[PDB]
């Protein structure tokens, strides 16, 4: 059809720019920490048509998608589907997306450095 | 009546070049339903001149690696290209292909010769069989290099190349290659 009057070309989701001129199942994939498969399941759990474009979602569907994103386990998303299943410091099934992934990688490498294992010393000798 | 693809008549097809009449085989003995025959057409010299020319084009679309052996893909491409040609110009695509081959064949080429350090070009004439061969090869190369990275299907670019080569316009890749080959051969008499 034609353009609606409320088409948003760029979305601001989890401090990430989302190109609205894309399919929703791949515009969500454009967020770090979300791939194609996880975006597909989070949009199917929200009961949202995948033929429908991302840039003209209303605010309610965007907020419901986000609430499923930071809360997967509350919406029957399986335990084995997540990024960090058994976190080493506090074991809980979680899904870090925007800044949590970069941070948690940083203290992962920092924990590897601080114990002077082979992997941390090798990776920080690599640069 | 035998018609290609259940639609395409071969009775009104005529060849306007007397050189290529015995080497373009589209007539009542060579009229076939499909460009797929799987015949032993290269086991003896000059045998491939009796091949239907649509089958020669189909065999020459199976190029560049990934497309080797995919003949059903190429007969699909040929069928869609023939439909696009008919729905564009309103005239039978067999005559369009025959005219494109006739206007696409180089009539005069060059040969690299040398004795020691002195490498030159000698102008020679081109046999009708090699005329047909380079015409088919340049048409396939023109279509393939034409699309390759755009929204245009291989069938649409192939149809456009046969249409513009039958017209003899300079926009075709095959016509430009024939023109530069004949220009070099004319400058190397």
């Amino acid at each position: 059809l034609v353009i609606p009057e409320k088409f948003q070309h760029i979305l601001r989701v989890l401090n990430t720019n989302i190109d609205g001129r894309r399919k929703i199942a791949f515009a969500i994939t454009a967020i770090k920490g979300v791939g194609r498969r996880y975006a597909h399941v989070v949009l199917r759990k929200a009961d949202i048509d995948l033929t429908k474009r991302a840039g003209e979602l209303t605010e309610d569907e965007v907020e419901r998608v986000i609430t499923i994103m930071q809360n997967p386990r509350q919406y029957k998303i399986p335990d084995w589907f997540l990024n960090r299943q058994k976190d080493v410091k506090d074991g809980k099934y979680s899904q870090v997306l925007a800044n949590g992934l970069d941070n948690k990688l940083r203290e992962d490498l920092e924990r590897l450095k601080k114990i002077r294992a082979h992997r941390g010393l090798r990776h920080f000798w690599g640069l | 009546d035998i018609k290609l693809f259940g639609k395409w008549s071969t009775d009104d097809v005529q060849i306007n070049d007397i050189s290529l009449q015995d080497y373009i085989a589209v007539k009542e003995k060579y009229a076939k339903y499909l460009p797929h025959s799987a015949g032993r057409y290269a086991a003896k010299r000059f045998r491939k001149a009796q091949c239907p020319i649509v089958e020669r084009l189909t065999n020459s679309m199976m190029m560049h690696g990934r497309n080797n052996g995919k003949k059903l893909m190429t007969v699909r491409i040929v069928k869609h290209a023939f439909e696009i040609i008919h729905l564009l110009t309103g005239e039978n695509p067999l005559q369009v292909l025959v005219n494109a081959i006739i206007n696409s064949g180089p009539r005069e080429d060059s040969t690299r010769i040398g004795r020691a350090g002195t490498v030159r070009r000698q102008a020679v004439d081109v046999s009708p069989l090699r005329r047909v061969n380079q015409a088919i090869w340049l048409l396939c190369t023109g279509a393939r290099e034409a699309a390759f990275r755009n929204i245009k299907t291989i069938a649409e670019c192939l149809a456009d190349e046969l249409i513009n080569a039958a017209k003899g316009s300079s926009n075709s890749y095959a016509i430009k290659k024939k023109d530069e080959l004949e220009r070099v051969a004319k400058s190397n008499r």
């Binding site: 034609v2 353009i3 609606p4 088409f7 | 869609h80 729905l87 929204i151 245009k152």
Partner: protein, 72 residues
Amino acid sequence: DKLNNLVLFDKATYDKLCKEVPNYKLITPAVVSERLKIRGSLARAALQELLSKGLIKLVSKHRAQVIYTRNT
């Protein structure tokens, strides 16, 4: 340079396609895509949309190539 084909129809583009597409003597998603600056999915969907109104004649359909023509 970089193509900037549109993803949903603007008003002027929709009007000019609805008054220009059913007479091209060649209707195919690629050609309407390249002459209307439309991404191929939107051009495709517009083509079965125009077929739904009976303004467009299908002559063959394939998974790789579907081709149309004018009515008369």
